Write a protein that binds this ligand. Structure first.
Ligand SMILES: [Mg+2]
Ligand SMILES: [Mg+2]
Lengths: 18, 354, 74, 95, 52, 93, 143, 81, 49
RNA sequence: ACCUCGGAGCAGAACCCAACCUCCGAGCAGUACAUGCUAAGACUUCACCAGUCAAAGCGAACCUCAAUUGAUCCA
């Protein structure tokens, strides 16, 4: 969720620049 | 509304800039291995392991067993190196390896396993089967000395009890042959108990064998404080685990408060508990041997109940919870006509007042 | 949300329960099937310290599958 | 709906209701699904299976159909080999 | 473009089923399950009635 | 009491005792029960039909047992991998 | 009356193997979008290191029951080229023996496509089957 | 009598069915081979080409294939009579 | 219900029992209109009969 | 000018949410012919009608897609 400490854990397109 | 993470984020450690200079996961297997080795890390968020049945594992368990034998690892590694070099010296072995034909003396490798590394695998198998949980109440031990028990049913063939074998009471009708290496200054207690099979009490155990003060390998000379009784798993019950524990005592200990009558065919008399036995005889002996097997109902169990326990045989049955249905509505809107069938008891015609 | 323990997925990506229990939401490491080409190439385009960590739903079953009752005394 | 008829002064019944619905003596009305035999070539087997079902009606629909039918259609019938004989009574229903 | 045709089995007679077929393609002979004989038998297209 | 049942022939009696040994009480009597209906008439009818079916099935021994692989496949594989462990030279009793 | 006939009409079987061997135990169905599948009772997991080959049979909950590794001295002292195909066949045969001694003979094996095409793994599962272990464990009863 | 007639018709239809099946599978195999052979012929006849796309090289190959089919049909007619 | 009728001094087993006897004892009410074709015998009280 | 259906915003984080508001689309297509039969438990476009998912089981090998659509009577 967006109000939780674990927000944004599934962020990967910042890793893959392609 | 935001909340800062309660610890390092999974992907924060790696650099975000200069991502061209970072080596990429060229394959699937390396990413897979990284993922599996990360899966067991202690994460600060909710995870599968937090919920799915680990019984709060991390806690030191009490070791009750012989100390490991002191070995000179330098000389042992040197000897192993000379052996592998000798193997290297031959060339027929290289021919066989390249020609895809290289069998092994599986007897030799199994014996080498028993002499060197058998105790560790035996202990892990025992803890997986829950022997320490159900016998020593959690305390662990490594069976240092290999033990060999084999049952006699006919003329030629084995039916051994390995680390988790399977034997029916037909093959366990009489006492098996037991062997193990011992020096002629040490007395031993052999014990056989069934973890599963107790009818009236769901935590007790049935004592099937108890020999005390075995003078080395002379198992025929140890006093019989409890005569051998074949296994008797119930008919509809599942599959039971019977275990032989082997202990060594420094000094001769004898006991009559534990001794059973000559027939001792009474289960109340054979109500046994390994933890209580170990607490009352804690000091004198120490466990060094362990073996076990599985037992499931066969036709010998019924005659065991016939003439040994002089009791009527119990039979069990694996039933399931009744199916769940919601509360019945007066108007089950859009439900099929068979909705009314989930709430009857008897599927036979009824005529109330007529 | 991705299916986890005792959570099935329907043809329209709906998540349903396979047992009777308590719903739990976790964040587990994501490893795609090697057949899934788009996901495996996305995986292989990642550097040495990257994991995906998708969100998963599990059901923790509440009752045992059954018990053993005395039926006859013969 | 002809609450009073010009011949006998009696309530009448809508015969479309009788042609389309079945009334169980407990008070439940059974109907067929709409479109259960129209364009089966564009429908999946699950959709057709749920369309072939005999389903129950709403409380509102049940009261409407009871108003639209006469008490003759609410009597207890004792047919010889009724396939809905066991459904005319309610069992294990609490309030 | 695509035409719905009726396919009738030989064994398990009387059982038919409708399938979509491209108009330009020849008549269909297909293996299909026949529930009145509880096994898969041949079905041959007959009496096309649709145009989609 | 199955043993003292003279109205059943000797070989069919022994065959029934062998093939329905899970229904023999301490005193040796065969036990058959029925719960299909709520009428004791129908329940007794089902019990009698069970008795007749057992008698006329054990009488005709050349029946061919159809293979099943739902519950006994595991048992047979376990028994095979068990018998695989039988190899010394000497032992008795 | 006979006091010995006190039976406690509910029976408790504490064996963690009883339900699974009865085949009525519950497999962890699902996950249905990730690899590998968790719907099994015991899995055969092969780690293929550069210097060594090891294989394990573990329950779903995580604990391993049997394993054969070329690191183990008993077979290391004998075999040649601890990374070889013949080495992995020896591993398969010895772990087949020790798993039969453990009493486990039903378990699943989930390879990647290239691992399943690997001749080492093909001969490995062949060594398993001729050792007497059947893969593709049976299905649940009243699943 | 009608029921027994239908039953006996169904019982003959089953044999007929087994018999034909293998025939339909062999026809499937043969027509698949024929289609693949036609594809191989089409792809073979377009190897001798200079430039650029299938606007002129393809029409020449199609004309050659049509002439080959006509020659084969004439040979078949001669063989028949 | 037939046993109850017999026990309560109603229709007498000492004579043949038919539709008219059942109606005169008032154990069943038959409606010729509304398409009733008589009495059907059911096994509700098969035992204790 | 529009009237039916779907995706995005408005409507930022359960659901819902108007406009003769801003933008895209649809009225098909492709592949098997178990696209068989049954059956717990659920969702649901704020009603209904429609619509959606699905365990187990019986059989038999060992489904893509977003919309892609039309009730009753009657023929
Ligand atoms: Mg709704
Ligand atoms: Mg299914």
């Amino acid at each position: 969720y967006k109000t939780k400490p674990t927000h944004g854990i599934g962020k990967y397109k910042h890793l893959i620049k392609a | 509304r935001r909340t800062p993470p309660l610890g390092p984020m999974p992907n924060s450690d790696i650099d975000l800039s200069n991502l061209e200079r970072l080596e990429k996961y060229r394959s699937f297997d390396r990413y897979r291995r990284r993922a599996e080795q990360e899966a067991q890390a202690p994460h600060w968020w909710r995870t599968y392991r937090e919920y799915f049945g680990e019984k709060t594992d991390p806690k030191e368990k009490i070791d009750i067993g012989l100390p490991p034998p002191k070995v000179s690892r330098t000389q042992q590694l040197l000897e192993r190196k000379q052996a592998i070099q000798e193997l290297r010296a031959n060339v027929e072995e290289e021919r066989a390896a390249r020609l895809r034909t290289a069998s092994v003396p599986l007897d030799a490798v199994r014996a080498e396993w028993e002499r060197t590394c058998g105790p560790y695998h035996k202990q892990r198998l025992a803890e997986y089967y829950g022997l320490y949980r159900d016998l020593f109440h959690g305390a662990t031990f490594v069976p240092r000395v290999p033990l060999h028990v084999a049952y006699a049913v006919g003329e030629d063939d084995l039916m051994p009890v390995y680390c988790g074998n399977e034997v029916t009471p037909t093959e366990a009708a009489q006492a098996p042959e037991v062997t193990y290496e011992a020096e002629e200054g040490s007395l031993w207690t052999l014990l056989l108990t069934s973890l599963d099979g107790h009818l009236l009490e769901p935590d007790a155990e049935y004592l099937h064998w108890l020999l005390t003060n075995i003078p080395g390998n002379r198992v025929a000379e140890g006093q019989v404080t409890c005569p051998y009784l074949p296994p008797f798993p119930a008919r509809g019950s599942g599959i039971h685990r019977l275990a032989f524990l082997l202990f060594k005592q420094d000094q001769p200990i004898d006991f009559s408060e534990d001794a059973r009558p000559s027939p001792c065919y009474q289960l109340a008399q054979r109500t046994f508990r390994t933890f209580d036995f170990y607490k009352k005889h804690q000091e004198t002996m120490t466990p060094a041997g362990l073996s076990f097997f599985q037992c499931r109902w066969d036709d010998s169990v019924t005659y065991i109940f016939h003439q040994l326990l002089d009791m009527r045989e119990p039979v069990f049955e694996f039933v399931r919870p009744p199916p769940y249905h919601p509360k019945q509505k007066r108007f089950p809107h859009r439900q099929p006509l068979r909705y009314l069938d989930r709430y009857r008891d008897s599927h036979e015609p009824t005529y109330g007042i007529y | 949300w991705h299916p986890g323990a005792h959570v099935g997925v329907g043809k329209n990506k709906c998540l349903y329960a396979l047992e009777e229990g308590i719903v739990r939401y976790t964040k587990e490491v994501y490893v795609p099937h090697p057949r899934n080409t788009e996901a495996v190439d996305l995986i292989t385009r990642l550097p040495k310290g990257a994991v995906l960590y998708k969100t998963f739903v599990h059901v923790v079953p509440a009752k045992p599958e059954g018990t053993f009752k005395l039926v006859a005394m013969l | 709906l002809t609450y009073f008829s010009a011949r006998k002064g009696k309530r009448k019944t809508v015969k479309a209701v009788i042609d389309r619905f079945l009334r169980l003596h407990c008070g439940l009305w059974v109907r067929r699904k709409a479109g259960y035999k129209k364009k089966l070539w564009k429908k999946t087997p699950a959709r057709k299976k749920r369309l072939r079902e005999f389903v129950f009606c709403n409380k509102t629909q049940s009261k409407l159909l009871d108003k639209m039918t006469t008490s003759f259609w609410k009597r207890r019938n004792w047919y010889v080999d009724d396939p809905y004989q066991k459904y005319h009574d309610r069992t294990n229903l609490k309030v | 473009k695509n035409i719905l045709v009726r396919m009738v089995s030989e064994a398990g007679t009387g059982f038919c089923f409708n399938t979509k077929r491209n108009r330009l393609r020849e008549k269909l002979t297909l293996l299909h399950y026949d529930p009145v004989v509880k096994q898969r038998v041949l079905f041959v297209e007959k009496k096309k009635i649709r145009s989609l | 009491h199955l043993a003292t049942a003279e109205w059943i022939a000797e070989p069919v009696r022994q065959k029934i005792a062998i093939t329905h040994k899970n229904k023999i009480n301490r005193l040796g009597e065969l036990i058959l029960t029925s719960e299909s209906s709520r009428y004791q008439f129908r329940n007794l009818a089902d019990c009698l039909q069970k008795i007749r079916d057992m008698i006329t099935e054990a009488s005709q021994t050349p029946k061919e047992p159809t293979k099943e692989d739902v519950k006994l496949h595991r048992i047979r594989i376990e028994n095979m991998n068990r018998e695989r462990l039988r190899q010394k030279r000497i032992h008795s009793a | 009356p006979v006091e010995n006939e006190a039976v406690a009409p509910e029976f408790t079987n504490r064996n963690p193997r009883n339900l699974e061997l009865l085949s009525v135990a519950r497999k962890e169905r699902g996950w249905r979008t990730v690899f590998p599948s968790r719907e099994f009772w015991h899995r055969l997991r092969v780690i293929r290191t550069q210097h060594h080959v090891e294989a394990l049979v573990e329950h779903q909950n995580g604990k391993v029951v049997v394993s054969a590794s070329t690191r183990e001295w008993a077979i290391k002292k004998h075999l040649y080229s601890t990374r070889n195909v013949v080495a992995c066949e020896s591993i398969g045969r010895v772990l087949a023996q020790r798993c039969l001694e453990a009493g486990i003979n039903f378990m699943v094996y989930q390879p990647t496509p290239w691992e399943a095409a690997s001749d080492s793994m093909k001969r490995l599962q062949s060594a398993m089957t001729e050792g007497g272990v059947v893969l593709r464990e049976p299905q649940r009863i009243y699943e | 009598q009608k029921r027994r007639e239908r039953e006996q018709h169904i019982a003959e239809c089953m044999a007929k069915m087994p018999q034909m099946i293998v025939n339909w599978q062999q026809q499937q195999r043969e027509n698949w081979e024929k289609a693949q052979a036609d594809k191989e012929r089409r792809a073979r006849l377009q190897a001798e080409a200079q430039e650029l796309l299938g606007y002129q090289v393809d029409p020449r190959s199609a004309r050659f294939q049509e002439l080959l089919q006509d020659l084969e049909k004439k040979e078949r007619k001669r063989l028949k009579e | 219900r037939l046993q109850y009728l017999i026990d309560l001094g109603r229709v007498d087993p000492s004579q043949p029992i038919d539709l008219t006897q059942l109606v005169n004892g008032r154990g069943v009410t038959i409606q010729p209109l509304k398409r009733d074709y008589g009495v059907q015998l059911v096994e509700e009280g098969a035992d204790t009969f």
